[PDB]
């Protein structure tokens, strides 16, 4: 067949990313079922729209029509009933926790309950899509759809099939991404970090490594990147945007001692209320329009040998 009709969207998971994907589709005219199994997760879903509404206002300029936003909110239906979420879905975007057992159970349900014209997309970045594509029962219409953080501003959509994904399904995901304000790109082979994380993770690791071994201050590393390479954002500016919560856990996942100290230092900034752009402060301080106001000085080494000593 083919996948060329995207009027109804089901998103599974209302978390940090889930909510951003829901608002992105809604904001571009699509009706969205916002599914979560636990009613509590949905009771404060309006909190997520408000948080997201600010991001739209700071980052988008003449984009962000507050009415578009309001009517987008009216196109969103929260639900604890998966059969209701799936009933007319032209695409399902699963954004549930990164647990393989959970993915398999969820997708088993989705495969039985959803129409046969429904395109199946998973948002995962910790797992491979082929690890649980079978659980959907329909691998030829199952692929991965990867987003960045603060997706309205950093609006990439990376489409990545398995060896079983039909090309029609790939083209459908690209189409869906185009219709929802995204820059869509085809990741032609199934690999762990798409394009974005494959580029970003070595680069961030090098940046924080330079800092943790006392080779320089975050502003130094970022300025060198910006000027030498003709760019706007160095690693530490990027950390602010990724947010310290993710980045700290990611650093802890390596078990490398210097990455641990990095993660702990991020913790100490989180505890003080500074976890990145979202708080208006991380490695840099920011203004209400998103403006970088300069580096936060207490990261600086002074005459300490490293950040830890």
CATH class bucket of the largest domain:
Alpha Beta
Proportion of residues in β-strands = 5-15%
Give Rg in angstroms.
20 Å
Number of strands: 10
Judging from the principal axes of the Cα atoms, what is the shape?
globular
Number of helical elements: 12
The name of the CATH architecture of the largest domain is 3-Layer(aba) Sandwich
Outline the biggest β-sheet.
8 strands, mixed
Q: How far is the N terminus from the C terminus?
A: 62 Å
* Tally of domains: 2
Q: CATH homologous superfamily name of the largest domain?
A: NAD(P)-binding Rossmann-like Domain
Helix percentage: 40-55%
Short description:
It is built from 12 helices and 10 strands. The longest helix is centred in the middle third of the chain and has 17 residues.
Question: Can you describe what's shown?
Answer:
With 309 residues, this protein is an alpha/beta fold. It has two domains: 8-187, NAD(P)-binding Rossmann-like Domain (Rossmann fold), CATH 3.40.50.720; 201-299, N-(1-d-carboxylethyl)-l-norvaline Dehydrogenase, domain 2. The chain is 44% helix and 15% strand. The chain contains twelve helices and ten strands. The protein has helices at residues 16-27, 39-43, 45-60, 66-74, 82-86, 100-113, 167-179, 196-212, 218-229, 235-242, 244-252, 257-271; strands at 8-12, 31-35, 76-79, 91-94, 119-122, 142-146, 156-161, 183-187, 284-286, 292-295. The strands form two sheets. An eight-stranded mixed sheet has the order 3-2-1-4-5-6-7-8. It has a two-stranded antiparallel sheet with strand order 9-10. α7 links the parallel β7 (156-161) and β8 (183-187). The termini are far apart.
């Amino acid at each position: 067949s083919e996948f060329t009709r995207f009027e109804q969207v089901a998103v599974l998971g209302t978390g940090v990313l889930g909510s951003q994907i829901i608002m992105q589709a809604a904001y571009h005219g699509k009706k969205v079922m916002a599914y979560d199994a636990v009613p509590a997760a949905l009771e404060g879903i309006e909190r997520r729209w408000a948080w997201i509404r600010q991001g739209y206002e700071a980052d988008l300029g003449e984009g962000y029509d507050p009415q578009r936003f309001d009517e987008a909110i009216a196109r969103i239906t929260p639900t604890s009933d998966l059969g209701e979420a799936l009933a007319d879905a032209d695409i399902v975007i699963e954004a549930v926790p990164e647990n393989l057992e959970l993915k398999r159970k969820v997708w088993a349900q989705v495969g039985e309950l959803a129409p046969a014209t429904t395109l199946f997309a998973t948002n995962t970045s910790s797992l491979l899509p082929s690890d649980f594509a079978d659980a959907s029962g329909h691998p030829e219409r199952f692929l991965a759809l990867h987003y960045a953080n603060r997706i309205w501003a950093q609006n990439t959509a990376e489409v990545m099939g398995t060896a079983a994904t039909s090309p029609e399904a790939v083209a459908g995901a690209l189409q869906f991404a185009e219709e929802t304000g995204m820059v869509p790109v085809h990741v032609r082979k199934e690999i762990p970090g798409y394009f974005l994380n494959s580029l970003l993770i070595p680069w961030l690791q090098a940046g924080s490594k330079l800092y943790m071994h006392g080779v320089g201050n975050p502003a130094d590393i970022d300025r060198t990147w910006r000027v030498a390479t003709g760019n706007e954002r160095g690693p530490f500016q990027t950390y602010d945007i990724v947010g310290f919560h993710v980045a700290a856990n990611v650093s802890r996942n390596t078990g490398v001692d210097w990455q641990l100290g990095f993660a702990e230092l991020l913790e100490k900034s989180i505890a003080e209320g500074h976890s990145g752009v979202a708080d208006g402060q991380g490695f840099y301080r920011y203004g209400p329009d998103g403006e970088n106001l300069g580096p936060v000085e207490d990261w600086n080494l002074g005459d300490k040998d490293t950040p830890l000593g």
